[PDB]
């Protein structure tokens, strides 16, 4: 009793945004690529090899958005031949795997750094930062290939308008065709989102349970109380935190009570950026990754007629917001990265 047809068009709302984002994006990652390379030194911060890589994939993406800005503008008309439609598409997914793979190497930096599972000679942090960055780019390009090979152009539906689209006609037969849509889709998001995002959640966890316990400096005599070491000479064993130390405890060095101590909140900015990145990363990339995952569950749990169409005319949006998640890391480094903000003022002056 049920039929399938689009929602009231958004006009040029998306292609507008697409250009806005190409505009801010090409100019915003343009910087964090100079700011990291304006520095020539071995004063490159650990988590900088990944911020560069983050900028490059966000960049190679947003440069193509003039292409996707017209195609969505002429209501799906691709006048750029099969090559670009292949290649341009191929770079949507390249960026998406890279952006994920960076944001966890960005995080696996802070786990290696801020928990140090092995001793510091064997921690090999630059290499683990740098071997990470190489095999990163090789995955995100390799596993992005079925979108290079299979995406073709073609006027579906008899309408005098070309469409760029995934064509399972090499790989599939007409009944198994939806299978390759589903498998190549649950691959993408799985490797693309659920594996990375839980990794970053896994990393983000172990960081807090060691970040958990707090050092404490004696405000009068200077002695610092680390909960790993403790003060076992005075009864209070290691691994204990400060508020549990019996309230009769006093400074081992001078003997003022707990009344005069001072928790150090060791100002880290590397970690605080890496989450604001991730928590907006996983806020823009969740929609597109929730719906594509419901709709390929939606052919294979048999969702009502209502739903499948819903999730189809929902999608061009979720694409478009997850697409902006590129031209935001440039803004986030501004509102939050010290090394970044400073490296800007500096060039400014000179001219």
């Amino acid at each position, epitope marked *: 009793e049920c*039929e*399938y047809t*689009d929602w009231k068009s958004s006009g040029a709302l998306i292609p507008a945004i697409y250009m806005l984002v190409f505009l801010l994006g090409t100019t915003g990652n343009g910087l964090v690529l100079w700011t990291v390379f304006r520095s020539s030194r071995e004063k490159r911060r650990s988590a900088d090899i990944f911020i560069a890589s983050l900028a490059v994939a966000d960049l190679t993406f947003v440069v193509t958005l003039p292409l996707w800005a017209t195609y969505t503008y002429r209501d799906y008309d691709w006048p750029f031949g099969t090559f670009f439609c292949k290649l341009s598409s191929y770079l949507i997914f390249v960026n998406m795997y890279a952006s994920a793979f960076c944001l966890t190497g960005l995080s696996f930096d802070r786990y290696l750094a801020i928990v140090r599972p092995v001793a510091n000679a064997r921690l090999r942090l630059r290499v683990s930062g740098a071997v990470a960055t190489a095999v990163l780019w090789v995955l995100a390009a390799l596993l992005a290939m079925p979108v290079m090979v299979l995406r073709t152009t073609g006027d*579906l539906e*008899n309408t005098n308008k070309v469409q760029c689209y995934m064509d399972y006609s090499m790989v599939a037969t007409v009944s198994s065709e939806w299978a390759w849509e589903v498998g190549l889709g649950v691959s993408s998001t799985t490797v693309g989102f659920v594996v990375p995002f839980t990794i970053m959640l896994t990393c983000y966890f172990f960081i807090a349970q060691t970040i958990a316990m707090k050092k404490y400096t004696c405000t009068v005599c200077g002695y610092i109380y680390n909960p790993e070491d403790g003060d076992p000479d005075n009864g209070v064993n290691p691994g204990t935190d400060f508020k549990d130390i019996p309230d009769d405890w006093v400074c081992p060095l001078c003997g003022v009570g707990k009344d005069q101590f001072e928790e150090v909140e060791e100002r880290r900015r590397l970690l605080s950026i890496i989450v604001v990145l991730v928590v907006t990363f996983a806020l823009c990339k969740m929609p597109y990754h929730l719906v594509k995952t419901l709709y390929m569950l939606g*052919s294979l749990l048999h969702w009502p007629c209502d739903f499948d169409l819903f999730l189809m005319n929902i999608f061009p949006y979720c694409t478009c917001i997850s697409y902006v998640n590129s031209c935001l890391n440039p803004f986030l480094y501004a509102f939050f990265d010290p090394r970044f903000r400073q490296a800007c003022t500096s060039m400014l002056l000179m001219g």
Partner: nanobody, 129 residues
Framework: QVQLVESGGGSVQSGGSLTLSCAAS????????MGWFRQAPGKEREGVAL???????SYADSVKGRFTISQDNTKNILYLQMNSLKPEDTAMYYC???????????????????????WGQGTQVTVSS
């Protein structure tokens, strides 16, 4: 793994009310679209009433306003309600079906690509004077 069986069409006289089921199997609304053709014969094959991505249904200029078409994912069946029938609509009707595309394309029915998709025997309709 996909079958389509046309049932409903015999002989009716002008101005009649026919309705033609295309009971479908293996197909999914989610992955597949549905449409109707016909042959005279002595002529060619011609699209009648399809189920499109963009417009609700793309009728042909001749059958427009007379035929009504509907899907029913519940029992998975495509319909063709023919009202006020013309003898030039004397012909044998088949239902096809076609795969759509990853929503990255727009869930677009591949109507044109090849119409070497899921077909059926056709059912034949006869309109006399």
């Amino acid at each position: 793994q996909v079958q389509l069986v046309e049932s409903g069409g015999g002989s009716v006289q002008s101005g009649g009310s026919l309705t033609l089921s295309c009971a479908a199997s293996g197909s999914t609304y989610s992955s597949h679209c549905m449409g109707w053709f016909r042959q005279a014969p002595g002529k060619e094959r011609e699209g009648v009433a399809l189920m499109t991505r963009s417009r609700g249904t793309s009728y042909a200029d001749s059958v427009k306003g007379r035929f009504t078409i509907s899907q029913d994912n519940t029992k998975n069946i495509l319909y063709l309600q023919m009202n006020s029938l013309k003898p030039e609509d004397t012909a044998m009707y088949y239902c096809a079906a076609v795969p759509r595309a990853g929503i990255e394309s727009g869930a677009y029915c591949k109507w044109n690509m090849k119409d070497s998709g899921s077909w059926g025997q056709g059912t034949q309709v006869t309109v006399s004077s």
